[PDB]
Amino acid sequence: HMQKVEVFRIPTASPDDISGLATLIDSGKINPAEIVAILGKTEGNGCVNDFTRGFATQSLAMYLAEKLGISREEVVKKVAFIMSGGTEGVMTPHITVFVRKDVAAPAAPGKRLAVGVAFTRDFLPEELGRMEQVNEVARAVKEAMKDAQIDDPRDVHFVQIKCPLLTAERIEDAKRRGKDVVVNDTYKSMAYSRGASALGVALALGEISADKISNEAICHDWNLYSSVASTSAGVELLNDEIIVVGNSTNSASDLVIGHSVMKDAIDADAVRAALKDAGIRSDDEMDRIVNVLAKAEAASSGTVRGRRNTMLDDSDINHTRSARAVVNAVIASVVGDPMVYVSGGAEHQGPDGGGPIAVIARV
Amino acid sequence: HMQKVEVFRIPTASPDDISGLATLIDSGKINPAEIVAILGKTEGNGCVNDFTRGFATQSLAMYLAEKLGISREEVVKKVAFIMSGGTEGVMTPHITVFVRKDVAAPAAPGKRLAVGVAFTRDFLPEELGRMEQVNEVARAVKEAMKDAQIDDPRDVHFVQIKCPLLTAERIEDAKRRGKDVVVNDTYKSMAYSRGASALGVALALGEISADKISNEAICHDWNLYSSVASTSAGVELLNDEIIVVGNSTNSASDLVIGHSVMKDAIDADAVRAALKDAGIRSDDEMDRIVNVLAKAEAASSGTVRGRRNTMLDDSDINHTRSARAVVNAVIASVVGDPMVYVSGGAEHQGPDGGGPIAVIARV
Amino acid sequence: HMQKVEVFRIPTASPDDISGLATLIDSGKINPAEIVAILGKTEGNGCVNDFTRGFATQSLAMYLAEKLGISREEVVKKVAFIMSGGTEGVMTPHITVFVRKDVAAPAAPGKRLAVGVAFTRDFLPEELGRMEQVNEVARAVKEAMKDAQIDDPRDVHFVQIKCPLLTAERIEDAKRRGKDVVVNDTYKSMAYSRGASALGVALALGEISADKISNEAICHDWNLYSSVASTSAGVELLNDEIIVVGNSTNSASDLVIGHSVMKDAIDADAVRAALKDAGIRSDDEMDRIVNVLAKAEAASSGTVRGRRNTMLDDSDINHTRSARAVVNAVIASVVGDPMVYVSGGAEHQGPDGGGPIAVIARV
Amino acid sequence: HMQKVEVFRIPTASPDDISGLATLIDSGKINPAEIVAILGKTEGNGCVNDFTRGFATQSLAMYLAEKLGISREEVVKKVAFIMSGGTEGVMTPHITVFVRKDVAAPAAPGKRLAVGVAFTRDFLPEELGRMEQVNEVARAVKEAMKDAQIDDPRDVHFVQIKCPLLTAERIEDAKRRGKDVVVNDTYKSMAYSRGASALGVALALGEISADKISNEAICHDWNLYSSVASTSAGVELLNDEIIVVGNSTNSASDLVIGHSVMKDAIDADAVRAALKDAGIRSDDEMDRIVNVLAKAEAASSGTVRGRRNTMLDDSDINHTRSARAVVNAVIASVVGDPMVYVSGGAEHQGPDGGGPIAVIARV
Numbered sequence A, B, C, D: 001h002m003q004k005v006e007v008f009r010i011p012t013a014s015p016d017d018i019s020g021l022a023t024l025i026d027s028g029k030i031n032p033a034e035i036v037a038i039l040g041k042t043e044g045n046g047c048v049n050d051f052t053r054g055f056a057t058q059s060l061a062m063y064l065a066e067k068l069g070i071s072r073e074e075v076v077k078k079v080a081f082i083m084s085g086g087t088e089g090v091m092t093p094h095i096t097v098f099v100r101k102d103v104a105a106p107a108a109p110g111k112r113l114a115v116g117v118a119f120t121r122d123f124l125p126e127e128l129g130r131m132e133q134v135n136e137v138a139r140a141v142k143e144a145m146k147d148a149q150i151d152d153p154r155d156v157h158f159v160q161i162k163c164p165l166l167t168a169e170r171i172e173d174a175k176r177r178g179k180d181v182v183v184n185d186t187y188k189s190m191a192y193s194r195g196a197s198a199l200g201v202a203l204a205l206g207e208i209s210a211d212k213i214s215n216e217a218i219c220h221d222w223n224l225y226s227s228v229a230s231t232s233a234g235v236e237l238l239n240d241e242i243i244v245v246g247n248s249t250n251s252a253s254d255l256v257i258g259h260s261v262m263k264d265a266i267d268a269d270a271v272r273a274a275l276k277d278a279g280i281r282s283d284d285e286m287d288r289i290v291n292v293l294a295k296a297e298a299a300s301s302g303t304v305r306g307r308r309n310t311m312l313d314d315s316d317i318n319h320t321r322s323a324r325a326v327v328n329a330v331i332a333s334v335v336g337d338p339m340v341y342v343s344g345g346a347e348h349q350g351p352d353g354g355g356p357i358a359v360i361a362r363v
């Protein structure tokens, strides 16, 4: 007996739309008890005051609890709900449902898709963006690796994380308790939480050594980055949820995952490199895409290939919204489909101005 | 007579930045008296309350007036200043300077780049988005065609237009004169002005017959569109400025212009088709690009290739900003350069959700 | 027979925050079976893509269903949920819970607070913003009056309404059945739905005669308006929910409601007039305020007291957001409390650029 | 000889609108050679990418240069141009023209309006938000104080300052020279620049002693604040421009200035205190207002009088824009006129969440 991971990319009409998942359950294509993780793009602003993330999670947990005959708390304690807000540009709201079954297939020669889930403890507000978050996330990434039955960190192609943020109220509550936070800015606290979580991935997978990580390097030393980490902050949770996605020889999945790294926001070559790494070597094989998952960010230099842009200066549109619109459009122009996962703010995720990109594809 | 058109794509540090144009004049590469048109991307929001367009026009007219020893009003009567606001995503602020001289070189056995300029009369607020603007623009397009020495409408590849819009103050002005405007929404009035101007192009070039155009069809009948029209609305002007760009046998330019039409916002094939129509058939020949000029818009269906997006539903970001970020990113991923011209809102400019795209290239 | 209305203004930490309402129920101060209506301010953008309204309604319906031992569908059929998004400026998110019980005490001398609730039938897309909605709302307002036991329309001080809007699917469905909608714009359909609902109130209360109302007058004739109507649009419902709030001789409530009409967005005199109409005649008595409820809008003239503003020209901030922030600030400067209900878009609710304002106060 | 200060509040139709000033000059009521300072509200977003400030300054300097027969550079060396962007809510765009004459008019009984102007040297990027800017501003405030013929710092009621900010290019320059900037964020650099300049005012006027000011206290110790300072950041200048406004015994002005300090954003009592300090003691005498000038900010506590708001959490609308809309709305409700000067970001200007407010009134 081995594991078989099935992945379903489901378009949504609204944050609370569960009809697509319900159709796959009522037809028997998805056993709801075998759902291990759901990764969504919700049509909020994707920043601090984005409540479509919790709206989407509450609706899915409410639906799965009534189908499984259990409580909502038991659902959210077992299944990872990672909602990335912000569907700018042509990016299509959707959810990606990860299902894991235990089938009895012979050990075929080769690595197939594997998935592992792990949660961290709740963090205090004054712990975000600091080593407490880095070390706790690294421990959970190793836990999710064994949950996915993956030994070689080279076989990990994507580590999706949902992490907390700071609000004005939580920063006030920390000041009243005599504590200091990593940054006094709610929007900027999302970057520190994403960066600390990303460095935790690189630490766990051996991508960077521990003697290089410190509080002063977080969101400062852009030479330190993971090539597979993908982290997203949200007001709706106080801990970190980790989804490790890779390939294992002890897998009966009809899917594989490959990945690459975009050097900048318009790096279309990395998109095709990630497709080839997933077994898709031509445009005619593009129908085997299950989903594309990528990180996007505005370069700290304020330029792309020596060309100035205003993402860091635009006070009307936060730069994470612009980055999502840009990279999603780039990926959409390559694969012919805008319904792909793009998350903004790639601190320590790929180089400065770039980010990891993975492709889940049929075989 | 023998015309030679030279085109300079100049990066800008701010809306009022004239240093790049001043350097090209002081080096002798540009005779300021031969400048006929300037097409700019300014880093305002590109909608109603975008004053970077007028800031850039005033700065350029003031500089050219002092260099030429003439008044600012004589400059704006002679040189077309078309400032398209909105540099979203990775799009780089810049201006494109068109210089036309009468050289004594033989007509190479082929059509080369030609440019023609024409202005319309000022419109009253109640004329925007109606037949008065359509017929007046149609006349100016023919006027600019003979300025470009282009007889066959088949040889016209891009018609850039700057047209007015409605503000709350101008709508009140029309009411106090007993007149009603085409729409009581300032942002939506830009669409009516862009569409009426675009229909004037299609009428002048024989793309649609006049018996099919009417007030009720403007911004309603999306079957009527020009394949080369590119219109941009602005608060800083009260008339329409026309720039006809094509190829003519009476041209000694070392440049040509080709074009295609994007069927939707992610139509990368149309970008490559426009490149091939301009003589670039491989990635290695892409260094011959002078500039790429394209229209972008949110499709009225709210979808791209059957995939929903929120451009028409996002009350925080107007859909013309989203469309500019998307199509510029797509073009940038193809040509490797985000410093290209993309204008949003393509009413009657290409199909619904698409727009014409032209490339000016060296030979 | 005898009614007692209790009103609780509860601050919320997020759209899904039910802790304040839960504390009042667990302490025994609120019997959840006696809740008849909940009027909330949710911290979404208050425009088209505001999902905090459904998020807040879903959370309250989910919580009350488990406390009452009934289904969520039965809760929304029993309790009126009117969620007004947009808490701009200093406006404090909160909910206002209306409790109506049947006590066995005689009606104290004078008229005391009375509340009545009624729902309309579901509307087809082609009926919104037209006479079908006006007459249907008018019927329900008259129905809710006797449910509140109010005979004299002079004793009605506030009519809060939640009304539907048009979406891309509902518009396309109407043309599929050979019908045309009042407007092809989702945001503008919210204004027509608010205006039609407001005209239904004025018709029911005898503020305007039926011979003056027609399809052409809806959102056109700003001389026709109600002085107590307060309407708010939302995507989460297909009918109109009506809350009539007034004073009745057959009431044992310890509260009363008075009201006035703001002639413009900065009409502080109207705020003080509404306070005295509710029995508060000095600054020292402001602690008797339970809540202040007001409508806000941008004047169609684009001016306030002869002074231009940019609300109708600002493409970065929707004008309904600006209007809510202004009137909330004006009320807060008078009562010393920014936690008051202010709803935007006051079509036929007060004069053009103004709106009704009511005060619920202790006696 | 004796000085006479005349102040003109002029409504504007656009950032580049000089028609109101031209009417007062063409009528002979204003001698353009006697203009010493112009304080404007321009309808840009009032944050980083607000180019209406430079647009207004360029348009006004260009106009006054042609009227005076001198160069534009000589005008900006002579006249203070302080353009504060952001006209949110109902706030009316306008400019305030300060004219100073040497008349032979009797010394009115009392101290009357006096104005003084002074400029600092240009600051290097590493000097913004630090003691170099504080000490340099303090000297210029003393220079403008004696320029206004004001001896007692108690007679200074308003010190308006325009200060620079940091851009990506200026940060690289400081980095290339081996220097570090106070903060690596363009938007937050406006706060540090505003705070350092404000502390320079308090230092110059003796409001706080020098031993309390340091680099670590800037934008941290909110107990240190000036009660008359009003600072505004802009990209269009590299130094600080200071306008000292007060009352002097050596003045023949028909005007006086009083002031108060708003304790929070809704402190209407402070508005009335500023009116009475300026000699306006009843509602009928508010027609003597020339202009009201105030600072606004979002309190770092995220609350107003114990009531939560979303200004520090709103990722769609910058909190300085919200603060301007609120405080302008509050002042408008008191004086009945939205055309008053309100500036956002009040670091070390009044208490945390408050700001100085001054009134210029006729006598």
Ligand SMILES: O=C(O)CC(=O)CC(=O)O
Pocket: A045, A046, A047, A050, A053, A083, A084, A085, A086, A190, A194, A231, A232, A233, A234, A320, A324, A342, A343, A344, A345
């Ligand atoms: O993932 C991103 O695009 C940025 C983020 O952390 C917040 C979110 O997704 O809601």
Ligand SMILES: O=C(O)CC(=O)CC(=O)O
Pocket: C045, C046, C047, C050, C053, C083, C084, C085, C086, C190, C194, C231, C232, C233, C234, C320, C324, C342, C343, C344, C345
């Ligand atoms: O009531 C308002 O403030 C505006 C509206 O109609 C939609 C909403 O409530 O979100």
Ligand SMILES: O=C(O)CC(=O)CC(=O)O
Pocket: D045, D046, D047, D050, D053, D083, D084, D085, D086, D190, D194, D231, D232, D233, D234, D320, D324, D342, D343, D344, D345
């Ligand atoms: O003065 C303000 O309102 C805030 C600021 O510094 C930037 C500006 O003025 O544009």
Ligand SMILES: [Ca+2]
Pocket: A225, A297, A346, A347, A348, A349, A350, A351, A352, A353, A354, A355
């Ligand atoms: Ca990165």
Ligand SMILES: [Ca+2]
Pocket: B297, B346, B347, B348, B349, B350, B351, B352, B353, B354, B355
């Ligand atoms: Ca089009």
Ligand SMILES: [Ca+2]
Pocket: C225, C297, C346, C347, C348, C349, C350, C351, C352, C353, C354, C355
């Ligand atoms: Ca109204």
Ligand SMILES: [Ca+2]
Pocket: D297, D346, D347, D348, D349, D350, D351, D352, D353, D354, D355
């Ligand atoms: Ca302050």
